[PDB]
Nucleic acid binder design. Structure first.
Length: 962
RNA sequence: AAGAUGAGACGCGUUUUAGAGCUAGAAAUAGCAAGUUAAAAUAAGGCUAGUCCGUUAUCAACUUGAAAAAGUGGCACCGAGUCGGUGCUU
DNA sequence: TTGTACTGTAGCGTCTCATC
DNA sequence: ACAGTACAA
């Protein structure tokens, strides 16, 4: 009748248990299915469900944002092509066609292999005239001559494809900048600012830095490149030209952070500085060649030809980084003389720089706007079409999705929240007139802020909400905005006004929700007639933070008791805090509860995260048709040590199930304060139904490194048309699940229709096409007449029973895993962990040394366990000469101290432990790696379907198939 | 303090192609010159065709069910190489 | 021509917004 | 876990 459930919850495992009152796990005879001759199995009512750890959604988020990024960038290019198509179809209609076909090989291209001009001599002349695109950019900015439309489009597409960061919020012209010494303009309205930077900053540090410079009639008589005006301290206050000089000096110091020198009068200082970089690289390469030919001709072959030895050829043609190439070439220029300028340029990281470099991420989008506005102002008179819609392309650079608007979905996304005012295709030119920025912006903040735990229909209150603030002031008086909005109202009595204070809630609601100037203005529109213009243009600055955790016993409410103070099963669980791994664990635990109540005739049993877990599992008693107890590990460990069965992870998966058992034992014992003689036998049975959960593998298709072209057939076609023979592709695809098939395949030059039984490994993208039509897909892979009703679906950790109890765990269609665990007597483990790890078992009183002198007789087990590994490895691992290796290494180091050999037998049990084979050393040397590539040996085995508890099986004998 | 989700952006990398290599060469190969950039893609792709979605989560098997979802399997004892048997029961 | 033994392979770094 | 090379038939 009566029984209890033991449970533990973890990232990867859910141990489960069944205990009748005197600490005894029952043992019962069960029923199986399938075509096997077995019809009754015996298993103890104890087990552990092991599964892969849950993944966080962060990687999918970074990928999803990346996909949206590339999509919108391609759309920007598409818009610019849409603009230029009408005019440049006159000069070259296939120009965009060649641009899109530039990836293809010469035969695959539908036009000439030279994209920019479609002929060799013009393309060569262009490349000679403009060594980089930046030469074209600078030429188009500076020269007033009429340009080819094609070069204009290259400049514009390069501009918008890499349009720079948007951290700089205002408009800006680049020619305002000057050397760090520009602070002389602040003086007349020293050392560069970097000596003052990278230090402590505060209001007092600001004060002392300003006072350390010379005072005068002005705030400083000499400003000494001080901190406060150049650097923002750690439209508002516009009601207050030192400010303008401070602003311009800040623009100067930023533009010196990005750009070096801008002497020559040009509107494209970025292109100028980078052409300076290019020309320096040219001159230094020529000097390098001359010096290496003069001094060291033998390393000339290594450096300038070998792409593998991290030379300059490795730096350009190979994948060498700038830092690694610098650290390679630095000793070469150190021991060889005449390269002091080379060393000082290397120490400045300005030596042989490329154009497209990882450090370009500091440049703002206003620089590209200045260059782009400049080229349109240059070419407007030659091409009136540019003058027709100049602001459109300018907008394409400046346009951005606002961070509060979200994805521009027509109600089909699972993340989007935008609210269009019209059913129009959103363009950068008409974004704000279509999208209701108001509803979308308020939807951003409301959809993510929580409801009250007592009232789940409405949002929690702001911390500074006004009638809530008066309620909280009343609460504090019985048991800040009163002193704050006194300033804005300029009266305390009208702050104490009561009648019209619900709208007064709604202003502070607005200023707690929104941050944007125009948005606060548009939502403050409602209160225009109550106040004058100056006071509400000052009031819109009152940005609020914080949300209060509330809503708007003998019959007492929570407030009255405070006067004497002293649904979806998925979504109710998934919404909690904590890692996604423990959420997967508790979902498995809920399924464990459902199965454990299903099995026994529907008989019910008798930190902050698990506090939530206890309530959510106690909800079951009235939601889904069991006293939920908060256990502690202390008495569990005390019972383990006192009754001489110590907790161990290194041997086997076994003690997680014994921990679930002892969890139920301690819970029943504390609700209750023979069985003490029962517990040591209960941990002593070697049959516990351990269930490795079986999952289809989801994730990326492959390792992401696109491997170069090859003649192999295992390259993955990264596009449909892109044949991976020529274009390169991915390797190491990830298996989804194995599919056992029985069919016939023709083999040999004289082909014969020979029957076959083998398992194919499906992968993630063809999983959809496989499940759409398995027979036609399997036909396409080559199999004739696959037996449709015998297609068996075999995901990872599918389990197979072979002869003499040997079990193997399916890793993939080309790889197995070990499926068996050994089980020592408990006295062996007691001897081991009293010998091994003194420092983390001892420190308890002298009974620890008493049980040490109970296990001193067990030194013979340092041989006997080697006999156990030999026996079990010959039985179910079949390790062949590796057994000879470990036995030999054992035999030469038996005479070592007990502690260290005990630790090293702990190190050997990585052989016998469940799952993958892994190397180990014992004392001396590493065992060579092994892999069970043979999936052949399970084709005649007995397949095991194991339930979530594993209690309910369906065994299939594969040899009876086909 | 300690971390979880979602939105907007940037810059590299990778791959293929374009950037005419020259001389001595039957040739094998040797000497020499050049090298900095661009285009396209960045999960195959999907249809509700959106400037949206595609790596998070769910999932033993079987019978129903497009799916969702529901259903499908005895007890007592003694032993224990991973569970075995006995007897009762219909 | 089809299976085993052995060693080698693996996309990445910033920035801005909101809360539990 | 899968690849690539190097051998046993």
């Amino acid at each position: 009748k009566k029984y209890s459930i033991g449970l533990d919850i973890g990232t990867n495992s859910v141990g489960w248990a069944v205990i009748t009152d005197e600490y005894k796990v029952p043992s019962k005879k069960f029923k199986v299915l399938g075509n096997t001759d077995r019809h009754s199995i015996k298993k103890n009512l104890i087990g552990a469900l092991l599964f892969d750890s849950g993944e966080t959604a962060e990687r999918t988020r970074l990928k999803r944002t990346a996909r949206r990024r590339y999509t919108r960038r391609k759309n920007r290019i598409c818009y610019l092509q849409e603009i230029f198509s009408n005019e440049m179809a006159k000069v070259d209609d296939s120009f965009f066609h060649r641009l899109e076909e530039s990836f293809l090989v010469e035969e695959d291209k539908k036009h000439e292999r030279h994209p920019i001009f479609g002929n060799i001599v013009d393309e060569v002349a262009y490349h000679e005239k403009y060594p980089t695109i930046y030469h074209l950019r600078k030429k188009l900015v500076d020269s007033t001559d009429k340009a080819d439309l094609r070069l204009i489009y290259l400049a514009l597409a390069h501009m918008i494809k890499f349009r720079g960061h948007f951290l700089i919020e205002g408009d800006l012209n680049p020619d305002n900048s000057d050397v760090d010494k520009l602070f002389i303009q602040l003086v007349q309205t020293g050392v560069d600012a970097k000596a003052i930077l990278s230090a402590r900053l505060s209001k007092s540090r600001r004060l002392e830095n300003l006072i350390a410079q010379l005072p005068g009639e002005k705030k400083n008589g000499l400003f000494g490149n001080l901190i406060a005006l150049s650097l923002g301290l750690t439209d508002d206050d516009l009601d207050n030209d030192l400010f303008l000089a401070a602003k311009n000096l800040s623009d100067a110091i930023l533009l010196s952070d990005i750009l070096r020198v801008n002497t020559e009068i040009t509107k494209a200082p970025l292109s100028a500085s980078m052409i300076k970089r290019y020309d320096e690289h040219h001159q230094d390469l020529t000097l390098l060649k001359a010096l290496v030919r003069q001094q060291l001709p033998e390393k000339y072959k290594e450096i300038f030809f070998d792409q593998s030895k991290n030379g300059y050829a490795g730096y350009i043609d190979g994948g060498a980084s700038q830092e690694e190439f610098y650290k390679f070439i630095k000793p070469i220029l150190e021991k060889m003389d005449g390269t002091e300028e080379l060393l000082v340029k290397l120490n400045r990281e300005d030596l042989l720089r490329k154009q497209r470099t990882f450090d370009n991420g500091s440049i703002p989008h206003q620089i590209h706007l200045g260059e782009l506005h400049a080229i349109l102002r240059r070419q407007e008179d030659f091409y009136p079409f540019l003058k027709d819609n100049r602001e459109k392309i300018e907008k394409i650079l400046t346009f951005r999705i606002p961070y509060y608007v979200g994805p521009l979905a027509r109600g089909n996304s699972r993340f989007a929240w935008m609210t269009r005012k019209s059913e129009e295709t959103i363009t950068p030119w008409n974004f704000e007139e279509v999208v209701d920025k108001g509803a979308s912006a308020q939807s951003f903040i409301e959809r993510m802020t929580n409801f009250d735990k007592n009232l789940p229909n409405e949002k929690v209150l702001p911390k500074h909400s006004l009638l809530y603030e008066y309620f909280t002031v009343y609460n504090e008086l019985t048991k800040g905005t009163y002193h704050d909005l006194l300033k804005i109202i300029k009266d305390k009595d009208f702050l104490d006004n009561e009648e019209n204070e619900d709208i007064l809630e709604d202003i502070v609601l607005t200023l707690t929700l929104f941050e944007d100037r125009e948005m606060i203005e548009e939502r403050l529109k409602t209160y225009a007639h109550l106040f004058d213009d100056k006071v509400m243009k000052q009031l819109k600055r009152r940005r609020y933070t914080g949300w209060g955790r509330l809503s708007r016993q003998s019959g007492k409410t929570i407030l009255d008791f405070l006067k004497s103070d002293g649904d979806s099963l998925h979504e109710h669980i998934a919404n909690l805090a904590g890692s996604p791994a423990i959420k997967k664990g508790i979902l498995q635990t809920v399924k464990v509860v459902d199965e454990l109540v299903k099995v026994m005739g529907r008989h019910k049993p008798e930190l902050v995260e698990t506090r939530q877990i206890t309530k959510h599992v106690a909800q079951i008693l009235d939601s889904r048709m069991v006293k939920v107890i908060t256990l502690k590990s202390k008495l569990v460990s005390d019972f383990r040590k006192d009754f001489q069965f110590y907790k161990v992870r290194e041997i086997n998966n076994y003690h997680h199930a014994h921990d679930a058992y002892l969890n139920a034992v301690v819970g029943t014992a504390l609700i209750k304060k023979r069985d003490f003689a029962t517990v040591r036998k209960v941990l002593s049975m070697p049959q516990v139904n351990i269930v490795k959960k079986t999952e289809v593998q989801t994730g990326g298709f492959s390792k992401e490194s696109i491997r170069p072209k090859r003649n192999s057939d295992k390259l993955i076609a990264r596009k449909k048309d892109w044949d991976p023979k020529k274009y390169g592709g991915f390797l190491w695809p990830t298996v989804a699940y194995s599919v056992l098939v029985v069919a016939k395949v023709e083999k040999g030059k004289s082909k014969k229709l020979k029957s076959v039984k083998e398992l194919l490994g499906i992968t993630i993208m063809e999983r959809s096409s496989f499940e759409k039509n398995p027979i036609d897909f399997l036909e396409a892979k080559g199999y004739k007449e696959v037996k449709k009703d015998l297609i068996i679906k075999l995901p990872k950790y599918s389990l197979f029973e072979l002869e003499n109890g040997r079990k193997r765990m399916l890793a993939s269609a080309k790889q197995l895993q070990k499926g068996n665990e050994l089980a020592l007597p408990s006295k062996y483990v007691n001897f081991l962990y009293l010998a091994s790890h003194y420092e983390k078992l001892k420190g308890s009183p002298e009974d620890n040394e008493q049980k040490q002198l109970f296990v001193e007789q067990h030194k013979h087990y340092l041989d006997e366990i080697i006999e156990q590994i030999s026996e079990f490895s010959k039985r179910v691992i079949l390790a062949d000469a590796n057994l000879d290796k470990v036995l030999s290494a054992y035999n030469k180091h038996r005479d070592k101290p007990i502690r260290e050999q005990a630790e090293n037998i702990i190190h050997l049990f990585t052989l016998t432990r469940l799952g993958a084979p892994r190397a180990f050393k014992y004392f001396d040397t590493t065992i060579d790696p092994k892999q069970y590539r043979s999936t052949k040996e399970v084709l005649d085995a007995t397949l095991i379907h194991q339930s979530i508890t594993g209690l309910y099986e369906t065994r299939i004998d594969l040899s009876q198939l086909g």
